[PDB]
Structures are given as structure tokens and as C-alpha cells.
Amino acid sequence: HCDLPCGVYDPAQARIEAESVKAIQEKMAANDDLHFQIRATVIKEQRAELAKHHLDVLWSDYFKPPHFESYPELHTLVNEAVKALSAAKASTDPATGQKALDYIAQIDKIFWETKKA
Amino acid sequence: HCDLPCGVYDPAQARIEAESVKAIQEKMAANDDLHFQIRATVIKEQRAELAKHHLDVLWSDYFKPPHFESYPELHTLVNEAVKALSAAKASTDPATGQKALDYIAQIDKIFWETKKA
Amino acid sequence: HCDLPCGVYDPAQARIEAESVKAIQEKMAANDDLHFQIRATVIKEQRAELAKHHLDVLWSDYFKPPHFESYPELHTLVNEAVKALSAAKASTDPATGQKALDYIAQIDKIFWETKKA
Amino acid sequence: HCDLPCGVYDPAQARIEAESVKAIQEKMAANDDLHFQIRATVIKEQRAELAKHHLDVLWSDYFKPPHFESYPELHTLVNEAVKALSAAKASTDPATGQKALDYIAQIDKIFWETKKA
Amino acid sequence: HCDLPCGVYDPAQARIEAESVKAIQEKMAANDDLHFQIRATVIKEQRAELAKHHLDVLWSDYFKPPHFESYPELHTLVNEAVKALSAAKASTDPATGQKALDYIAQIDKIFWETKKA
Amino acid sequence: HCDLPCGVYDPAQARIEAESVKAIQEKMAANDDLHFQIRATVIKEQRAELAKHHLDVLWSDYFKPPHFESYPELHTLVNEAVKALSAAKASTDPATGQKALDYIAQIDKIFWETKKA
Numbered sequence: 001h002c003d004l005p006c007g008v009y010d011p012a013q014a015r016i017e018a019e020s021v022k023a024i025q026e027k028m029a030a031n032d033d034l035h036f037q038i039r040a041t042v043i044k045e046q047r048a049e050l051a052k053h054h055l056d057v058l059w060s061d062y063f064k065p066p067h068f069e070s071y072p073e074l075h076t077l078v079n080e081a082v083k084a085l086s087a088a089k090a091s092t093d094p095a096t097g098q099k100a101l102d103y104i105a106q107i108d109k110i111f112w113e114t115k116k117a
Numbered sequence: 118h119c120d121l122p123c124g125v126y127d128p129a130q131a132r133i134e135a136e137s138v139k140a141i142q143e144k145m146a147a148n149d150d151l152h153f154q155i156r157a158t159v160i161k162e163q164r165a166e167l168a169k170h171h172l173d174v175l176w177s178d179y180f181k182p183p184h185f186e187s188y189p190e191l192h193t194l195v196n197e198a199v200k201a202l203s204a205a206k207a208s209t210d211p212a213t214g215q216k217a218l219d220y221i222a223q224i225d226k227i228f229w230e231t232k233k234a
Numbered sequence: 235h236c237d238l239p240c241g242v243y244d245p246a247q248a249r250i251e252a253e254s255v256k257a258i259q260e261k262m263a264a265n266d267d268l269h270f271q272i273r274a275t276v277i278k279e280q281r282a283e284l285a286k287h288h289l290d291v292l293w294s295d296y297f298k299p300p301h302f303e304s305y306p307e308l309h310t311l312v313n314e315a316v317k318a319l320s321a322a323k324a325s326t327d328p329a330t331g332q333k334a335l336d337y338i339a340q341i342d343k344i345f346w347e348t349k350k351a
Numbered sequence: 352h353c354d355l356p357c358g359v360y361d362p363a364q365a366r367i368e369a370e371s372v373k374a375i376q377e378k379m380a381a382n383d384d385l386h387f388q389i390r391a392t393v394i395k396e397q398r399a400e401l402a403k404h405h406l407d408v409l410w411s412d413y414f415k416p417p418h419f420e421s422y423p424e425l426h427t428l429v430n431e432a433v434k435a436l437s438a439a440k441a442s443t444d445p446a447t448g449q450k451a452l453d454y455i456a457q458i459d460k461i462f463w464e465t466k467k468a
Numbered sequence: 469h470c471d472l473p474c475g476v477y478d479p480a481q482a483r484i485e486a487e488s489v490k491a492i493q494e495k496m497a498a499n500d501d502l503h504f505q506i507r508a509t510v511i512k513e514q515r516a517e518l519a520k521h522h523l524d525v526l527w528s529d530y531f532k533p534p535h536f537e538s539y540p541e542l543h544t545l546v547n548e549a550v551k552a553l554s555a556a557k558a559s560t561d562p563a564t565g566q567k568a569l570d571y572i573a574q575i576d577k578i579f580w581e582t583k584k585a
Numbered sequence: 586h587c588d589l590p591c592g593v594y595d596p597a598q599a600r601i602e603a604e605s606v607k608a609i610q611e612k613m614a615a616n617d618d619l620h621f622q623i624r625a626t627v628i629k630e631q632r633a634e635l636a637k638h639h640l641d642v643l644w645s646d647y648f649k650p651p652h653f654e655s656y657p658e659l660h661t662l663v664n665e666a667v668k669a670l671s672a673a674k675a676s677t678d679p680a681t682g683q684k685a686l687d688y689i690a691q692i693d694k695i696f697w698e699t700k701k702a
């Protein structure tokens with residue numbers, strides 16, 4: 001995942017950050033304090049960006065040309081996933097964070113399928 | 118390009134970093150000094166990574182569904198471009214840096230076409 | 235611009251980031267939503283910092299003693315440009331982003347003139 | 352793990368980076384090419400640093416006084432873990448990468464035990 | 469402090485950032501403007517994080533087993549110091565920034581004592 | 586130094602990093618091990634870059650127009666200091682690291698004079 005290549009990848013990296021994004025959105029609903037809202041937004045932005053980065057790495061480094069042919073929907077799937085994260089950045093609604101997680105789950109399923117192949 | 122969204126994008130960002138990658142490769146081909154080789158390698162790795170990031174942003178943030186439908190080869194094009202940058206990281210051959218630049222030129226063409234549309 | 239040196243420089247890196255700064259300020263004029271204002275501020279802060287960095291690099295790495303001699307006002311100009319960016323970080327008024335862009339245009343003109351000699 | 356706090360933590364973050372560190376060391380033993388050795392060193396340094404960061408976060412943010420009371424060896428264990436990672440940075444011997452992984456596994460075991468109580 | 473190791477360390481790095489944290493909190497009390505509060509919060513978050521990093525480095529890299537043996541309360545002290553910084557991130561009260569500074573001063577004293585010996 | 590502004594600055598930040606640069610060069614002169622030379626070069630590059638950044642901040646943020654009027658050679662001094670750091674990046678000779686330290690010491694003196702003004 002470091003581009004050496006090292007041969008070590010795991011959608012878990014993207015997933016954990018996306019989980020923080022949703023968890024933060026849930027907390028933003030229980031505290032309307034201005035400064036908490038600012039910190040939550042700041043931090044959510046950072047974790048969502050990291051989640052996007054991890055997915056980008058899987059897309060550009062892990063997945064090889066043949067994978068996109070075996071899974072015709074893969075390109076679209078990853079693109080929708082990063083866009084869902086961009087949407088989560090601009091929202092306090094936990095549903096947006098969950099949508100990103102749902103796409104990540106689909107990518108994770110394909111990831112392991114290609115690993116066992 | 119910052120995901121606000123700000124509406125400001127330019128493949129030039131990716132291109133300038135990719136140009137540094139090739140320039141460094143050419144300089145490495147002319148100075149076999151150990152420490153220069155180390156520094157050149159370290160720095161080439163950083164600039165190539167930045168180039169990959171910029172391309173990832175165009176793909177994930179700027180380009181929208183309509184664009185991918187109008188340009189069915191766009192997904193693969195950007196993917197091959199970033200993969201070319203990964204190959205440039207692992208090489209001192211300027212040809213690898215040029216390959217990355219050629220792909221970026223193709224992405225640049227498509228980018229501006231979508232801007233005028 | 236990487237300090238190898240690589241021999242590749244372009245004021246465009248600073249300009250593009252400064253354009254994002256102003257573009258963000260313009261979007262802040264149209265929407266008073268709290269979370270949008272927080273995100274806009276956070277991201278504007280980040281792009282203005284990158285813009286200052288790119289200018290600092292031109293100043294520290296690209297421009298040489300002969301350049302400061304030929305253009306006695308260069309030091310002041312670059313210093314005013316980065317200070318203008320600091321002012322843009324602290325403002326939502328597009329006029330501040332415009333002022334930084336104007337200074338950058340002056341630096342850009344001098345830059346290309348030095349590429350001619 | 353982001354200090355909001357968000358309530359999301361997992362030693363897996365540290366483990367994955369540590370796994371990359373060991374994997375890189377194994378590759379370095381089999382390929383003596385100078386440029387590969389340089390790139391592998393650069394990247395290993397980066398992943399080991401990330402691994403240390405993740406462990407530092409668990410130690411500073413996740414673990415609380417009651418935990419250090421229940422596990423009087425915890426401070427020492429995490430300190431040994433990060434020191435093991437520093438040792439891996441300075442080594443091409445996969446054994447150092449494995450030692451770090453051994454400590455991370457012990458930290459992981461304690462982490463999950465605190466999730467049961 | 470860079471993990472080479474270079475043999476150069478100074479608690480002053482953590483202190484200077486902690487001083488900014490407090491100074492920002494002091495300023496937050498004299499200006500209730502929304503955008504200033506947002507920027508102040510964003511920046512305080514960043515400086516507090518850097519302060520935590522510097523302390524983490526002293527703990528993980530500089531302090532060695534003999535030091536922890538000579539100062540049995542050191543682990544707790546550094547851990548409380550970073551936790552104090554996390555508390556400072558979540559507060560506008562200068563008292564939180566002060567508490568972090570006080571722990572840092574304690575660490576600084578111990579640091580120089582181990583340097584004389 | 587964080588651009589809030591926070592009112593906290595100290596040339597010591599630049600000095601400490603520059604000290605690491607020289608300390609690393611001294612170590613490089615004594616240990617010819619290939620892997621150590623690689624890691625030392627990689628890390629020296631990073632610390633020198635941080636030193637340059639700290640100096641750039643004093644120049645762009647701390648020093649104001651009146652300061653440059655009172656000390657006409659300040660622009661040149663800082664510029665020479667950062668260029669000396671770039672030279673240190675490209676050298677293993679401790680003398681280059683010392684030259685940067687000498688310039689920083691000159692800047693430090695002017696800095697404290699402006700503080701007392």
C-alpha cells in the first residue's frame with residue numbers, strides 16, 4: 001500500500017477511517033456546542049480525506065488491469081465510494097457516513113475475492 | 118480540488134510534478150554519485166506521489182458520472198496514468214517519466230473539453 | 235522546486251492555490267450556513283498555506299542573488315504576497331484573495347523574465 | 352483515534368504498517384540493487400513511523416489510568432513496541448520487524464481485553 | 469528526535485507549541501467573532517497535536533529504560549501531559565493550556581537532569 | 586508562528602532542526618555503512634526542510650515592514666540562511682551544517698532586538 005510495492009493491503013484502513021467519520025456525525029447530533037461542532041467538522045474532514053486516500057491507493061496500486069475487467073463495476077464502485085466520502089465531509093447526517101461504509105463493504109468483498117483467486 | 122468544493126481544478130498540478138519526476142530521472146542518468154543518487158531517489162518518490170494524488174483528485178472529485186459516460190475510456194486512462202507514475206518511482210529511466218507525462222497529456226485534453234462543454 | 239535541485243519551477247503552483255483561496259471566499263459570500271462556513275474556513279486555511287509555501291520556495295530556491303540585484307523590489311514583493319495570503323486566511327472578503335493574486339501576478343512576470351536572460 | 356474523541360480505535364492500524372515494515376525487510380534481503388535498497392529504506396522508514404504514531408495514539412488517547420492500573424506492564428510494553436519499530440527502521444533484518452509485531456500482538460490482546468470489561 | 473538517531477532533543481519543541489495553544493485560548497476570550505473562533509479552534513487543534521507529537525518522541529525515542537528506572541513516575545507524567553494537551557484541544561479555557569505547560573515543565577526538568585548525568 | 590496569529594515565535598525552532606542537520610553530518614563522516622548513509626541522507630533532508638520552513642515563517646509572518654526597514658540586510662540574511670540549508674541537504678560535510686547555524690544565529694539576534702523594541 002506504500003508503492004514499493006510491499007504486497008500488504010487491507011480495505012480495513014479505509015474502513016476504520018470511514019467508521020470514525022460516521023461516529024463523529026453521530027456525536028455531532030448530541031452536542032450543539034459551537035466549539036465542539038467546529039472541532040468535529042475539522043476532524044471529520046481529516047478522517048474522510050484519509051479514507052479517500054486509502055481507497056485511492058487500492059484503486060491505483062492494488063487492483064490491476066485484469067481486476068477491472070473481471071469486475072466491470074469496480075471503477076464505478078470505487079469512484080462512488082470516494083464521492084460518498086466527499087458527501088460525508090459536507091454533511092452531519094450519519095446516513096452519509098453509512099453510505100460510504102456500504103460502498104467500502106462492496107469493495108472489501110471484491111478485494112478478498114481477488115486475494116483468494 | 119480541495120473538496121469544499123472550490124470549483125478550481127487544473128491538470129497542471131499533476132503535470133508539473135510529473136515534469137519534476139522526469140527531470141530528476143535525467144539528472145540521475147548524468148551523476149552516479151552515491152549521495153546524489155540517494156537524494157534524487159528520495160525526492161523523485163515524493164514528487165511522483167504528489168502527481169498521483171493530483172490525478173486521483175481529478176478522478177474522484179472533478180470528473181462526474183456524465184463525464185465517464187461520455188468518455189468510456191476515462192477510468193482506465195487515469196488508472197494507467199497513476200500506475201505509470203508508480204513505475205516511474207521504481208525507475209531511473211526518463212522514458213518512464215515521459216510515459217506518465219503522455220498519459221497526463223491525454224487526461225489534460227479530456228479535462229479541458231469537459232470545461233468548454 | 236523540490237530542492238534536489240530538479241530545475242523545474244512554475245509560479246502556477248502558487249497561483250492555482252491562491253485562486254482556490256479566492257474562489258472559496260466568493261462561495262462564502264453566498265452561504266451563511268454554519269457548517270459550510272466552518273468547512274470553507276478550514277479548507278481556505280489549508281490552500282492559503284500551500285500558496286505561501288510555493289512562494290517561499292520560489293524565493294528561497296529559484297531566485298538567486300543576481301535576481302535580487304536586477305529586481306531590488308523582489309524581496310519586498312514576495313514578502314507582501316505571502317503576507318497578503320495570511321490576510322486572506324483571516325478574511326472572507328474576496329478582495330483579500332484578489333490582492334494576493336495581484337502580487338503573485340507581479341512575481342510571475344518577474345519569474346518569466348528571469349527565465350529569458 | 353482522532354482525538355475528538357470519536358471512540359473508534361483498533362490496533363490493526365499499527366499492525367498493518369508493521370506488517371509492511373517486515374515485508375519490506377524480507378524483500379530487501381533478496382534484492383541487493385542499489386536503487387531498490389534506497390526506495391525500500393525510504394518507504395520502510397515511513398511505514399515504521401506511521402506504526403509508531405498509531406501506537407502512541409493508543410497509549411496517549413485510548414488507554415486511561417484505570418487501564419495502566421490493571422496492566423502495570425502496559426507503559427513498558429508500548430514503549431518497547433515503539434522502540435522495536437525504531438530498531439526496525441535501522442535494520443534490514445526481518446527479525447526486527449517481527450519483534451515489533453510480537454509486541455503489537457500483546458498490545459492488541461490487552462486492547463481487546465479492555466473492550467470486554 | 470528524528471529517529472536516525474541524531475542525538476539531538478529539546479523539550480522546548482513541545483513547550484513552544486504548548487505556549488501557542490495557551491496564547492490562542494487567551495485570545496479566544498477577547499474576540500467572539502465567528503470566523504476568528506473557527507480559525508482559533510482549527511489552529512489550536514494543530515499546535516496541540518504537534519506538542520503531543522514532540523512529547524511522544526521524547527517518551528519513545530529519548531527516554532530509555534535507565535531513565536524510567538531512575539524516574540518511576542515518568543511514564544505517568546508524559547501520559548498525563550499528552551492527555552492535558554487533548555483536554556486543551558477540547559477547551560477555550562487558558563487553564564487547560566496552562567496545565568499542559570506545567571507538565572511539560574516537569575518533563576523538561578527531568579530531561580536536563582538526565583542530560584547532565 | 587501558526588498564522589492565527591498567535592504571537593508566539595522563536596528562532597529556536599529553526600536552530601534545533603539545524604543542529605540535528607549538523608549532528609547527522611558528523612555521524613555520516615564516521616560511519617560509511619551504506620544503509621546508514623541512506624537513512625542519514627533521508628532524515629537530514631527532512632530536518633533541513635523543517636529548518637527552512639521555520640525560517641520562512643519568521644520571514645513571512647513574524648518580521649513586519651518596519652523590521653525590514655530597520656534592518657535592510659534581513660531579507661538577504663534569511664535568504665542566505667535557507668540557501669545554506671539547501672546546501673547542507675546536498676552535503677555530508679558538517680561545515681555546511683555549521684554555516685547554516687551561523688546564519689540562524691545572526692537572525693536570532695535581530696529577532697530578539699525587534700522583540701525588545
Ligand code: 3NI
Pocket residue numbers: 001002003004005006007008371
Ligand atoms: Ni505498501
Ligand code: 3NI
Pocket residue numbers: 118119120121122123124125254
Ligand atoms: Ni478544491
Ligand code: 3NI
Pocket residue numbers: 137235236237238239240241242
Ligand atoms: Ni524541485
Ligand code: 3NI
Pocket residue numbers: 020352353354355356357358359
Ligand atoms: Ni478518533
Ligand code: 3NI
Pocket residue numbers: 469470471472473474475476605
Ligand atoms: Ni532526531
Ligand code: 3NI
Pocket residue numbers: 488586587588589590591592593
Ligand atoms: Ni503561531
